[PDB]
Amino acid sequence: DTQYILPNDIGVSSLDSREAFRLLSPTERLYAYHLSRAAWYGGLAVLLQTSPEAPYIYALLSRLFRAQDPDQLRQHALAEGLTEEEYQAFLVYAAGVYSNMGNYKSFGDTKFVPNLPKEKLERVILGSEAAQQHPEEVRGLWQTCGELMFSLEPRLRHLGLGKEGITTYFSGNCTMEDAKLAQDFLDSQNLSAYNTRLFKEVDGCGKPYYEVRLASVLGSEPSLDSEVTSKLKSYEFRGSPFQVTRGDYAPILQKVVEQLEKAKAYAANSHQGQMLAQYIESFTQGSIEAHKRGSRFWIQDKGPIVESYIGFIESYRDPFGSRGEFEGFVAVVNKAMSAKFERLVASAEQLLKELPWPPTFEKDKFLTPDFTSLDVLTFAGSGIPAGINIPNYDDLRQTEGFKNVSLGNVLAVAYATQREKLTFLEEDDKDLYILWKGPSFDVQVGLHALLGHGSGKLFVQDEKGAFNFDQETVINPETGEQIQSWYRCGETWDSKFSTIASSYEECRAESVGLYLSLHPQVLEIFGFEGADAEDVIYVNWLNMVRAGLLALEFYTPEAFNWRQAHMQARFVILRVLLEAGEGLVTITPTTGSDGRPDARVRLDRSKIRSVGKPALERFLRRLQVLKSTGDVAGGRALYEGYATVTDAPPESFLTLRDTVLLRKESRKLIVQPNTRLEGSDVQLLEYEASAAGLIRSFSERFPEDGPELEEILTQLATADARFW
Ligand SMILES: [Mg+2]
Ligand SMILES: [Zn+2]
């Protein structure tokens, strides 16, 4: 029962962005203001992309804390018979639903419910101030999402397709087969899935009618553009009728383009103004092509003061793994920290040569990638990462280039751990861990994006029998014969690997990071060159091994399914270094000070280069070979081979899993600042590092459209209620 529950004393931290914001000029602040607003508007779309009840839950809480702040509500809640412990349980839950934009954890895809009796919360909500101003709206909301807010039925606990899970990227009656069928339909029409959803309905006959709905401001009405309009029709695909519609998240996206236009007025240069014009095109029409062209302009704007990106980008939470979750961020460049990353780019092309795979599997042309350290002012969406490689359009990654980003002030929050909190470690390891995990993470994050995601060439064939590579000269180094597999027209990385695409690529990126972290030159770029360099390496690997063990929390044993892509990647890497044997990694079941079941992680420092590196190189070379040729069947057999969780000796993971769950530590919530505009001045509003502080950060997040946004999210959820 500890699962599906956010602990009262869950950690909360705020972002250090006060100083970064002060550096900006009066115009750049107006540029960052509207971009941030656009992001937060679009962030609400995640509610519709999470759970059926998430829009209702957000709207219900947004009405509560609008009338009564967390301290005003406290007096009311305690007067109704709730203990202070039970009230804090509600604040944490609300702060949870806010920081994830849904009642499911973005990192774990797990449902969480309030930690208090259902009837006690009913008394608080139905007896509140917002319930006496708009009783019709409040009581309605409570009768709609009341049971679902607390219901922990097995089918509701996790995100997923079929009867066994919950997802709003699809309808309730959808299964994996419907997703694969729809995917082939999209590849054949050359229509991207990044901003689409799939709905399978049935007529009075029982014959399933599939509907693909693109996300856009404009609806069924005709517009000027025809690149999307000429696709809005009915189809006949393998005996199954397909309909391509749009207008998804229309009122929300309408608010988004409003702020994108206003931001274009304060645009720095021409590229920033053209990319926003295309983003407006993509959100108004529903054109990923418009987004692709906008992203193309975005890569051209190198070293900007106010970096930004927005749209349906990442596909982690899509059960099939091709549909994008809406996000967007505004950040100020940290020219101080970014000095360490541009020297890495200076020798980046060099480091790509010492990678395990032959130079025929690397991008033929190496464009200089823009790598900058950023201080985040705003990151809308489900959660916040440490670093990002963008865009995810593979054709752009080998044409115009790409941008690497390390979030400076986000790493600052992560750089916080107590000695007793560190689990599955020996006492002598704890010291080196605390001392070096900070610098070691910068090492990993840098290689993860630049030389990890930023490397690798995909084999593509055009309409004619011509390839972007010489067919007669390229040899598969794992087979011996020439290449017999490639990406056809319209096929992308995600469309072919689907349900493991996200995990597979991060694992390839993670392994690259570990691999190239052994290079004394790379460490010199950050500045270590010595025994301190040796320690960073040991920590970078010990962290990886320990993460692999901790990853067992995000595995569901009954469905044989991984819920988090990055953690599945590290468990794979963990098993790769256990397959290598030679006493490199050992996991031993022990007993802690409290007497509860425990475990220990031991890693041999001297055998990292003699046993670890060659084992990782073999694994690293196989990954890229199967990615470039696009060999799914083999790619799956390899990755899902090491991603298999069984309690086979000597590790016995299923038994260790309970130990991990028993002693697990929830990740901390993050409070983000706000920007307010009075006359011509742009001020920065900061908040408390608390649950109540986080709630206040959202109550003042929409000053104008408070009541209106709650109205939009409500009716948008009401229309599609039939699907679930
Ligand atoms: Mg389902
Ligand atoms: Zn990554």
Short mmCIF file of all heavy atoms in Angstrom, two decimals, residues 160-167 171-172 174, ligand 1:
data_model
loop_
_atom_site.label_atom_id
_atom_site.label_comp_id
_atom_site.label_asym_id
_atom_site.label_seq_id
_atom_site.Cartn_x
_atom_site.Cartn_y
_atom_site.Cartn_z
N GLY A 160 -1.07 1.63 -19.64
CA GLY A 160 -0.85 0.60 -20.64
C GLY A 160 -2.05 0.30 -21.51
O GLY A 160 -3.17 0.73 -21.22
N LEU A 161 -1.82 -0.46 -22.57
CA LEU A 161 -2.87 -0.83 -23.51
C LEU A 161 -3.59 -2.10 -23.08
O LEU A 161 -3.06 -2.91 -22.31
CB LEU A 161 -2.29 -1.01 -24.91
CG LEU A 161 -2.09 0.29 -25.69
CD1 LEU A 161 -1.41 0.01 -27.02
CD2 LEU A 161 -3.43 0.97 -25.89
N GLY A 162 -4.81 -2.28 -23.59
CA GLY A 162 -5.61 -3.44 -23.25
C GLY A 162 -6.39 -3.23 -21.97
O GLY A 162 -6.36 -2.15 -21.38
N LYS A 163 -7.09 -4.27 -21.53
CA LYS A 163 -7.92 -4.19 -20.34
C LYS A 163 -7.08 -4.05 -19.07
O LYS A 163 -7.59 -3.64 -18.02
CB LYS A 163 -8.81 -5.44 -20.23
CG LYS A 163 -9.58 -5.78 -21.49
CD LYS A 163 -10.42 -7.03 -21.28
CE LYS A 163 -9.56 -8.21 -20.83
NZ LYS A 163 -10.38 -9.43 -20.56
N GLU A 164 -5.80 -4.37 -19.17
CA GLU A 164 -4.92 -4.45 -18.00
C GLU A 164 -4.36 -3.10 -17.57
O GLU A 164 -3.77 -2.98 -16.49
CB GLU A 164 -3.77 -5.42 -18.27
CG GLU A 164 -4.21 -6.85 -18.60
CD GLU A 164 -4.67 -7.63 -17.38
OE1 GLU A 164 -5.61 -7.18 -16.69
OE2 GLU A 164 -4.09 -8.70 -17.11
N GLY A 165 -4.52 -2.09 -18.42
CA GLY A 165 -3.96 -0.78 -18.13
C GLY A 165 -4.86 0.39 -18.45
O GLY A 165 -6.04 0.23 -18.74
N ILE A 166 -4.28 1.59 -18.37
CA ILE A 166 -5.00 2.83 -18.65
C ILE A 166 -4.14 3.73 -19.52
O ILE A 166 -2.96 3.91 -19.26
CB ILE A 166 -5.38 3.57 -17.35
CG1 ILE A 166 -6.49 2.82 -16.61
CG2 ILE A 166 -5.82 4.99 -17.64
CD1 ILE A 166 -7.77 2.72 -17.41
N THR A 167 -4.73 4.29 -20.57
CA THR A 167 -4.03 5.26 -21.41
C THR A 167 -5.06 6.09 -22.16
O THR A 167 -6.14 5.59 -22.50
CB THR A 167 -3.07 4.58 -22.40
OG1 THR A 167 -2.37 5.57 -23.15
CG2 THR A 167 -3.82 3.66 -23.35
N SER A 171 -8.25 4.58 -27.09
CA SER A 171 -9.53 4.34 -26.43
C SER A 171 -9.40 3.11 -25.52
O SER A 171 -8.45 2.33 -25.65
CB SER A 171 -10.65 4.15 -27.45
OG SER A 171 -10.34 3.14 -28.39
N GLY A 172 -10.36 2.94 -24.62
CA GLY A 172 -10.30 1.88 -23.63
C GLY A 172 -10.29 0.48 -24.19
O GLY A 172 -9.69 -0.43 -23.61
N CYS A 174 -8.92 -0.49 -26.94
CA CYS A 174 -7.76 -0.69 -27.80
C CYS A 174 -6.75 -1.68 -27.20
O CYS A 174 -6.60 -1.77 -25.98
CB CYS A 174 -7.05 0.64 -28.08
SG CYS A 174 -7.78 1.63 -29.39
MG MG B 1 -6.34 0.27 -21.61
#
